């Protein structure tokens, strides 16, 4: 039941999603090993992901969380990078999309920094890079990220450099405690707490 609707570059919605993508690029501690060397992207396409059943699954769970947290879903828009982006947009997030080895346990991880999610497009640590050239810094091959609506509810705060949520919480927030420029990362433990709203197709750009 998934349909993908292309947004025009003239559409304010295209422009606001592009800006979130470009404006949350940072430098990574690996010097670009996992995700490549770049300061900005070439955005090729932004599509709205439309699935009624997956949307209703999300909103149902959002209302449950909200009623357990003084009517506050604590909903954010966050990036997700994965080799399984085609399955996510068709069947939703579920326990097959869980980072078993994540630092906050086996859940589904999201980032405020688009460049953080970019490191996972070709797999954990960037895998072996693009399928065509085996290059984690490929500037030719088209990459995809999801920009997702995520219900955090009561989030457990972890200060730091499928499982269950900590008791009494709906998610975990990984707060950076060393790299002053890094934005937060987040984990949910139920697929129904995220909806993949935008599919973004891009290339990373070689710095001049």
Interacting span for ligand WLH (CB under 6 A) from 61-69, 118-126, 164-172, 200-208: 118-126
50 is in an annotated binding site: no
Other C-beta atoms closer than 10 Å to the C-beta of 45 total: 15
Residue 111 touches ligand WLH, criterion: CB under 6 A: yes
Residue 141 touches Zn ion, criterion: CB under 5 A: yes
Closest alpha carbon to 171 in 84, 69, 59, 83: 69
Which CB atom, from 132 or from 178, has the smaller least distance to Zn ion?
Answer: 132
Closest alpha carbon to 64 in 56, 30, 38, 28: 56
Question: Min. distance of Cβ 142 from Zn ion in angstroms?
Answer: 9
115, 117, 151, 165: which one binds ligand WLH (CB under 6 A): 117
17, 21, 138, 146: which one binds Zn ion (CB under 5 A): 138
Residue 77 touches ligand WLH, criterion: CB under 6 A: no
Residue 121 touches Zn ion, criterion: CB under 5 A: no
CB 21 within 8 A of CB 205: no
Residue 80 touches ligand WLH, criterion: CB under 6 A: yes
Question: Min. distance of Cβ 43 from ligand WLH in angstroms?
Answer: 17
Question: Min. distance of Cβ 100 from ligand WLH in angstroms?
Answer: 9
Instruction: Look up tokens 């990459």; give the residue.
Output: 143
133 is in an annotated binding site: yes
Query: Residue 58 in 3-state DSSP?
Result: helix
Length of the chain as a residue count: 208
CB 176 within 8 A of CB 117: no
Instruction: Look up tokens 């909103």; give the residue.
Output: 59
Distance CA 178, CA 91 (A): 37
Residue set of the binding site:
130, 133, 138, 141
List, as residue ranges, the binding site for Zn(2+). Answer: 130, 133, 138, 141
């Amino acid at each position: 039941g998934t349909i993908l609707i292309d947004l025009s570059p003239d559409d304010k919605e295209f422009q606001s999603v592009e800006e979130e993508m470009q404006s949350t690029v940072r430098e990574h501690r690996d010097g670009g090993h996992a995700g490549g060397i770049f300061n900005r992207y070439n955005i090729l396409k932004i599509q709205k992901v439309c699935n009624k059943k997956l949307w209703e699954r999300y909103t149902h769970r959002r209302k449950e969380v909200s009623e357990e947290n003084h009517n506050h879903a604590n909903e954010r828009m966050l990036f997700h990078g994965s080799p399984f982006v085609n399955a996510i947009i068709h069947k939703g997030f579920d326990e097959r999309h869980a980072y078993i080895g994540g630092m906050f346990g086996a859940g589904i991880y999201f980032a405020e920094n688009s460049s953080k999610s970019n490191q996972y497009v070709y797999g954990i640590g960037g895998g072996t890079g693009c399928p065509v050239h085996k290059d984690r810094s490929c500037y030719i091959c088209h990459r995809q990220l999801l920009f997702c609506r995520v219900t955090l509810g009561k989030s457990f705060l972890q200060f730091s450099a499928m499982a269950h949520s900590p008791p009494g919480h709906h998610s975990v927030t990984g707060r950076p405690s060393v790299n002053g420029l890094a934005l937060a990362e987040y984990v949910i433990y139920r697929g129904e707490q995220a909806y993949p709203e935008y599919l973004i197709t891009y290339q990373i750009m070689r710095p001049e």
